[PDB]
Structures are given as structure tokens and as C-alpha cells.
Design a protein around this ligand. Structure first.
Ligand SMILES: O=C1C(=O)N(Cc2cccc(O)c2)[C@H]2CNC[C@@H]2N1Cc1cccc(O)c1
Ligand SMILES: CCOC(=O)c1cccc(N)c1
Ligand SMILES: CCOC(=O)c1cccc(N)c1
Ligand SMILES: [Cl-]
Ligand SMILES: [Cl-]
Ligand SMILES: [Cl-]
Lengths: 99, 99
């Protein structure tokens, strides 16, 4: 698909058996999702941006379906105001910027 | 151009006659640049990120080149951790997400 940027590029994702809305975010290195259960070991991480940093839990080898495209990668879980699909998963669905 | 996301989508911009590096950020509604001098009056704005908020100065109708593409629009100035080109200007240069 081609997604314009007149509004926030929000898409439906499936993760851990749950449906969520998430923002395709080329400015994000990492993918960060609101609190939810995920399988496996985790380690703590701090991620920062405007406003400062939040503490998240890092889970690896998590499968996500993004707008119908399956990908696997690291997913951070924590108190993010918005669910964010970052570059680590955008690459896996073949997402590019074009102009 | 077509820009992949294996690395940060950093580009050269020109603003106030000077070249700077900036990130093409589809997760950002607005464009925010590090402290610099811009002409005219400014208005207050707050922008929200993953860790909270910052106050910024809003300047309108600012001339700015992004990857050599000419734009004129709203530029926010403040303590952003990186120069960010957001959707307000990405739309002006005809930028889309594709996969
Ligand atoms: O503030 C943030 C933010 O926290 N991040 C960083 C981030 C967020 C999530 C994961 C990750 O690895 C990094 C940025 C990333 N793009 C816009 C995310 N923003 C929003 C933003 C920024 C500038 C101007 C705006 O109008 C909006
Ligand atoms: C502490 C470093 O902060 C960041 O990576 C960042 C901040 C604002 C926007 C974006 N896209 C990234
Ligand atoms: C308080 C509202 O916060 C946001 O709009 C936001 C947070 C993190 C990443 C991005 N891209 C946006
Ligand atoms: Cl990953
Ligand atoms: Cl590729
Ligand atoms: Cl604008």
C-alpha cells in the first residue's frame, strides 16, 4: 500500500493474539507498545525523546502482523502514550519513504 | 528518492541559509529544529513525546529545503534531541510511506 501523511499513519497490528492500533514511525529506532503480556525473558531499557525518557521491558523474537505483513523482532513494552512501530520492524515489511 | 529504513532517515536540510542534518519522521506531526534564530514573531506551542512535553517556539511560513526540495511552512524551535522533519512538511514535499 501507499500511505499518505495528511494524518497520522495509524494501522492495525496483531501482537500476542491482540489487535492494537499503532503508528508507523520512521523517527523511532525501536518498536514500543503499551503494557501487555508477551512471552519470554526480558531486560530493562530506557528510551528517550521529547519530554525525556521512559523505562521499558525489552522482549526479543516477537512476531507482529503489521497491516497484514508478518515480521519478527524486538518489541519494547512500557508506558508509551502511543503504540509505535519503529524502524526495526518497518524494514521487515519493506516499508520505504518516497518522494 | 526512495529511502529505506535500515539506518535513520537522516537528510540534509537548509534553513536560515545554513545546512543542517534532520530526521524524516512520520511519527512527528510537526517539524522541530534545534535552537537557532528565525525571523518574525513566534507563538507558543507544546509538543508531546514518549517521555513528556517540551515548550517550543512556533514560527510560520519559514522557507526550508528538505533533500533539495523547497518547502515553506511552520517550524518549531526548541530543545529537541535531533532536528525533526514532521508530517506538516513531509506532505509538502510529497512524501509517502510505501510497502
Ligand atoms: O517525542 C517523540 C519521541 O519520543 N520519539 C522517540 C521514540 C519513540 C518511540 C520509540 C523510539 O525508539 C523513539 C519520536 C520518534 N518519532 C516521533 C516521536 N516523538 C514525537 C514527536 C517528535 C518531534 C516532533 C513532533 O511533533 C512529535
Ligand atoms: C534521546 C534521543 O531522542 C530521540 O531519539 C528522538 C527525539 C525526538 C524525535 C525522534 N524521532 C527521536
Ligand atoms: C502525548 C502524545 O505523545 C505522542 O504523540 C507520541 C509519543 C511517542 C511517539 C510518537 N511518535 C508520538
Ligand atoms: Cl529487532
Ligand atoms: Cl530493503
Ligand atoms: Cl506547515
Amino acid at each position: 500500500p501507499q500511505i499518505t501523511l495528511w494524518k497520522r499513519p495509524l494501522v492495525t497490528i496483531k501482537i500476542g493474539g491482540q489487535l492494537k492500533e499503532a503508528l508507523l514511525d520512521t523517527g523511532a529506532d525501536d518498536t514500543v507498545i503499551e503494557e501487555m503480556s508477551l512471552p519470554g525473558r526480558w531486560k530493562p531499557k530506557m528510551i528517550g525523546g521529547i519530554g525525556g525518557f521512559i523505562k521499558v521491558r525489552q522482549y526479543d523474537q516477537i512476531i507482529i502482523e503489521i497491516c497484514g505483513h508478518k515480521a519478527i523482532g524486538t518489541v519494547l513494552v512500557g508506558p508509551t502514550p502511543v503504540n509505535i512501530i519503529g524502524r526495526n520492524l518497518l524494514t521487515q515489511i519493506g516499508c520505504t519513504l518516497n518522494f
